[PDB]
């Protein structure tokens, strides 16, 4: 069978916690007053929720209300508990309240207001300096949640809300987040296609926080090379082929051989043989101002097949790429 794997950091954080911290299924939700909130405008709808601009009429402040679609009671308490555990953390969206919507008959999460502008709307027009700046802000959120025993599992531009005027960033949509427990096998049907790590694409279930670091790498590659998305697969199989055309097939086989994983035989007719490409191949006159030796080294250390070999969030924050960013 497959060889087991463990996170190399924050491995045992949940094993030492009281049950109450990670046992989300036992969580007793504390309900506020739906009457406090007036819905203003529908901002978005996904498979799991509809999101609204609203106002809290008890203090006149703007808020965002996310009305959860019926999904699985388990997933609802999981998101709630994760949001409560992470509250006040660096660049983590703040859950202000939880109420029952009278029409949907489901929970509605109330978040402190953020500007209705996601990172996807900005990240292709940032300066070199600002790419570094906002990458560091995203890393603060990731190292915090990882240190708290939680992996986000859906890191992507749409899940980073940015207020560029105020140089402010929040990581949102914790509906796919999970608690990391060593030796646990997780669902590989997480993350969005272009941001899925190789572990997901080869069906390796014993993954960890390092999944998020692959996703972050994909974002970085897209920004510095001005290529959206960087790995542009037409489905989940072709997604792995697109990765292999950059990182090469020999290191892919080394990865799957390390963990004693077998590829879906469906790959035999599509994967081929590909050399590792040098990162300089993606540099051109229109993106070169965004590329530096430090950027390429950093990217190279995020986009590794072997999840155990990727930089952790904290190691990433130590990287020379961030030396030019002013620290508070
Ligand atoms: C179009 C859009 C605008 C937003 O402001 C949010 C979202 C979507 C959103 O999905 C979201 C999810 C979430 O878990 C917390 C949020 O604050 C949010 C949001 O704030
Ligand atoms: Cl899941
Ligand atoms: Cl980490």
């Amino acid at each position: 069978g497959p060889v087991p794997s463990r996170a190399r950091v924050y491995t045992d954080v949940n094993t030492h916690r009281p049950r109450e911290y990670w046992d989300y299924e036992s969580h007793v939700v504390e309900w506020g007053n739906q009457d406090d909130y007036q819905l203003v405008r529908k901002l978005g709808r996904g498979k799991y929720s509809e999101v609204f601009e609203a106002i809290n009429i008890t203090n006149n402040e703007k808020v965002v209300v996310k009305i959860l679609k019926p999904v699985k009671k388990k997933k609802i308490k999981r998101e709630i508990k994760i949001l409560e555990n992470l509250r006040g953390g660096p660049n983590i969206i703040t859950l202000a309240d939880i109420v029952k919507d009278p029409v949907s008959r489901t929970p509605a999460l109330v978040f402190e207001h953020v500007n209705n502008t996601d990172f996807k709307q900005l990240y292709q027009t940032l300066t070199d300096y600002d790419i570094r700046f906002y990458m560091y802000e995203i890393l603060k959120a990731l190292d915090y949640c990882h240190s708290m025993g939680i992996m986000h599992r859906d890191v992507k531009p749409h899940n980073v809300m940015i207020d560029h005027e105020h140089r402010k960033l929040r990581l949102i949509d914790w509906g796919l987040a999970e608690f990391y427990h060593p030796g646990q096998e997780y669902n590989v049907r997480v993350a969005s296609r272009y941001f899925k790590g190789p572990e997901l694409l080869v069906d390796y279930q014993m993954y960890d926080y390092s999944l998020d670091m692959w996703s972050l790498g994909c974002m970085l590659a897209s920004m510095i090379f001005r290529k959206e998305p960087f790995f542009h697969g037409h489905d989940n199989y072709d997604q792995l082929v697109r990765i292999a055309k950059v990182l090469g097939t020999e290191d892919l086989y080394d990865y799957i051989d390390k963990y004693n994983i077998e590829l879906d035989p469906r790959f035999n007719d599509i994967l081929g043989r590909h050399s590792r490409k040098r990162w300089e191949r993606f540099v051109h006159s229109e993106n070169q101002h965004l590329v530096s030796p430090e950027a390429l080294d950093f990217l190279d250390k995020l986009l590794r097949y072997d999840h155990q070999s990727r930089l952790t969030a904290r190691e990433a924050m130590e990287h020379p790429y961030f030396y030019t960013v002013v620290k508070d």
Side-chain angles (χ1 to χ4, degrees), residues 43 51 64 66 93 111 114 116 161 172-173:
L43 298 175
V51 176
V64 170
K66 181 181 172 176
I93 198 68
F111 296 98
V114 296
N116 180 207
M161 297 299 285
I172 63 152
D173 203 347

Side-chain angles (χ1 to χ4, degrees), residues 9-10 142-143 146 209-210 213 311-314:
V9 295
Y10 309 124
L142 293 177
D143 182 53
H146 297 170
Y209 314 111
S210 57
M213 302 303 297
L311 294 174
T312 69
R314 179 68 83 109

Side-chain angles (χ1 to χ4, degrees), residues 255-295:
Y255 173 53
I256 64 172
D257 293 349
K258 177 168 173 192
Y259 296 94
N260 288 20
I261 296 152
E262 185 155 50
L263 290 182
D264 185 334
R266 182 196 315 248
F267 283 105
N268 294 159
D269 294 333
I270 64 176
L271 189 55
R273 298 202 287 171
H274 304 284
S275 63
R276 191 134 196 139
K277 306 311 180 296
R278 304 193 111 106
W279 292 107
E280 288 80 12
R281 205 194 281 172
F282 307 99
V283 180
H284 54 63
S285 55
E286 288 70 47
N287 67 25
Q288 64 181 232
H289 60 113
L290 305 172
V291 177
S292 56
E294 291 84 2

